[PDB]
């Protein structure tokens, strides 16, 4: 479309998330107004407990949106038929938007697989959220189902895993930890004792779709061990969350919250698959302690940004898993607005720590092939970081985000109207 057409639409109808074209113009506006002017502080305008939350997320990476977003959005009803879900829930998760904006330069199928991984986290997360309820309302049978489901999901990933190197089989086996007694090494594979295949989990079609894609696209030619490793890390992290939420006593320090979020943020699973889509790839990076720390900084930054944006909804849930609330519980002088400011500052320091690790990792590369592989893998994580910021910035239509931001709808409609008008005015120059 031409700037004049979209300007006419925006003046009449405003911005939406149901017309997928609008998101291309929103992302283009954000790059021209912020990144292109050397301003890497993106605005977040929301509320928490009636307090105005007006902050900026620092992220110095180039904004972009996948060219496949149009087709992904156009096929969302068929995608959603895979899931056990209402459309209301599917629309708020909006994995078409998440993947298109965090994975902007991949093929259609390599973008969709990231959508699937993020949706898996969201659906498992909302099943775990039953434990947020007061103890009076918790149903032990739903918790039994949840615990059984994640073991069966875990085995489905185990079932596509047949590493070429025996040390890689041992890497995963030793990493199973408290799940290890349920499995055995057969065939050169890890297999769940069939005694425990006692149900079909509600999202088994999703998990089978993921496993089939990784099996058919990457397992023939690539070492997929890190994908398996990150899924094991995630599933164990969910079990850790079940334990903490089931205990109804939340005593995590901020450092322990960080260590926990390192496991459950799910972006490391998306990165592991995206790493496999590039010829520049170093499997040895995943056991480099500095690279492992870089991945942890990335998960924590996304966590802290998410903590600010979801604070009001989680406050009403009485959910303690939020750095904003951890800081308030430690420091009685903080209200929600002041706590959000401290979290944003922590996210800035983590971003600087991420950039310091990046320079160290690239300097340590042994040869050109390894340097180019590491630079590509770090770029993939940077894509996720700016993508997540713009994801939260662009929550402009109620029902199509986890946390709708009516002040951002108003702010972006006002600012993009002026930017499009300036485009039309100077046309064709
Ligand atoms: C969508 C992407 C790319 C990453 C964000 C992942 C993330 C931080 C999710 C929050 S998990 P949690 O805080 O337990 O969930 P809610 O209470 O916010 O529903
Ligand atoms: Mg949250
Ligand atoms: Mg949380």
Swiss-Prot record:
Catalytic activity reported: (2E)-geranyl diphosphate + L-glutamate = N-geranyl-L-glutamate + diphosphate
One GO term (biological process): cellular response to carbon dioxide
Pathway terms, separated by semicolons: Secondary metabolite biosynthesis
Record note on what altering residue 122 to L does: Strongly reduced activity
Keyword Metal-binding (UniProt): yes
Outcome when changing residue 313 to A: Complete loss of activity
Reported impact of residue 402 to A: Complete loss of activity
Binding, Mg(2+) 2: 314, 321
Cofactor note: Can also use Mn(2+) ions as cofactors with a lower efficiency.
Induction entry: Up-regulated under phosphate limitation and by increasing partial pressure of CO(2).
GO molecular function list: metal ion binding; transferase activity
Binding site for Mg(2+) 1: 306, 310, 314
Domain of life: Eukaryota
Cofactor(s) the protein requires to work: Mg(2+)
Enzyme class: transferase
Enzyme Commission number(s) from the entry: 2.5.1.-
InterPro entries with a match to the protein in the record: Isoprenoid_synthase_dom_sf
Keywords: Magnesium, Metal-binding, Transferase
Family (UniProt): Belongs to the terpene synthase family.
Its biological purpose: Magnesium-dependent glutamate N-prenyltransferase: part of the gene cluster that mediates the biosynthesis of domoic acid (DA) and derivatives, natural products with neurochemical activity acting as ionotropic glutamate receptor (iGluR) agonists, thus being neurotoxins causing amnesic shellfish poisoning (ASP). Catalyzes the conversion of L-glutamic acid (L-Glu) to N-geranyl-L-glutamic acid (NGG) in the presence of geranyl diphosphate (GPP). Also able to catalyze the formation of farnesyl-L-glutamate from farnesyl diphosphate (FPP). Cannot use dimethylallyl diphosphate (DMAPP) as substrate.
Protein name per the record: Magnesium-dependent glutamate N-prenyltransferase
Protein's organism: Pseudo-nitzschia multiseries
């Amino acid at each position: 479309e031409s700037p004049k057409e979209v300007l006419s639409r925006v003046q009449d109808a405003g911005l939406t998330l149901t017309n997928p074209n609008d998101l291309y113009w929103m992302v283009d506006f954000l790059k021209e107004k912020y990144y292109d002017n050397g301003d890497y502080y993106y605005p977040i305008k929301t509320v928490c407990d009636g307090e105005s939350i007006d902050v900026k997320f620092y992220c110095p990476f180039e904004p972009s949106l996948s060219p496949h977003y149009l087709e992904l959005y156009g096929s969302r009803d068929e995608r959603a038929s895979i899931y056990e879900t209402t459309m209301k829930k599917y629309n708020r998760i909006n994995s078409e938007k998440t993947s298109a904006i965090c994975t902007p330069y991949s093929s259609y199928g390599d973008t969709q697989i990231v959508a699937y991984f993020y949706s898996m986290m969201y659906y498992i997360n909302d099943q775990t959220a039953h434990l947020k309820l007061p103890e009076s309302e918790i149903e032990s049978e739903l918790i039994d189902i949840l615990n059984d489901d994640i073991l069966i999901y875990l085995n489905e990933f185990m079932s596509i895993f047949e590493p070429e190197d025996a040390q890689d089989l041992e890497r995963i086996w030793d990493f199973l930890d408290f799940y290890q007694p349920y499995f055995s090494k057969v065939d050169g594979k890890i297999v769940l004792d069939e005694k425990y295949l006692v149900r079909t989990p509600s999202q088994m079609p999703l998990i089978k779709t993921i496993c089939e894609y990784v099996s058919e696209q990457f397992a023939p030619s690539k070492n997929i061990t890190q994908v398996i490793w990150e899924v094991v890390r995630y599933i164990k992290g969910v079990k850790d969350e079940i334990h903490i939420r089931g205990d109804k006593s939340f005593t995590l320090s901020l450092q322990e919250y960080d260590d926990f979020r390192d496991k459950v943020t799910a972006s490391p699973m998306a990165h592991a698959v995206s790493d496999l889509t590039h010829e520049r790839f170093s499997y040895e990076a995943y056991t480099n302690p500095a690279f492992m720390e870089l991945e942890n900084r990335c998960s924590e930054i996304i966590t802290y940004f998410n903590d600010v944006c979801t604070s009001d909804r989680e406050r009403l849930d009485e959910d303690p898993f939020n750095s904003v609330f951890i800081l308030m519980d430690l420091d009685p002088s903080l209200n929600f607005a002041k706590s959000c400011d401290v979290v944003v500052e922590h996210a800035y320091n983590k971003m600087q720590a991420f950039l310091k690790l990046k320079e160290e990792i690239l300097e340590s590369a042994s040869d050109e092939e390894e340097r180019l592989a590491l630079a590509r893998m770090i770029k993939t994580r940077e894509d996720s970081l700016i993508g997540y910021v713009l994801h939260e910035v662009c929550c402009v239509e109620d029902g199509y985000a986890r946390d709708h931001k009516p002040l951002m709808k108003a702010f972006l409609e006002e600012e993009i109207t002026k930017s499009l008008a300036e485009k039309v005015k100077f046309n064709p120059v």
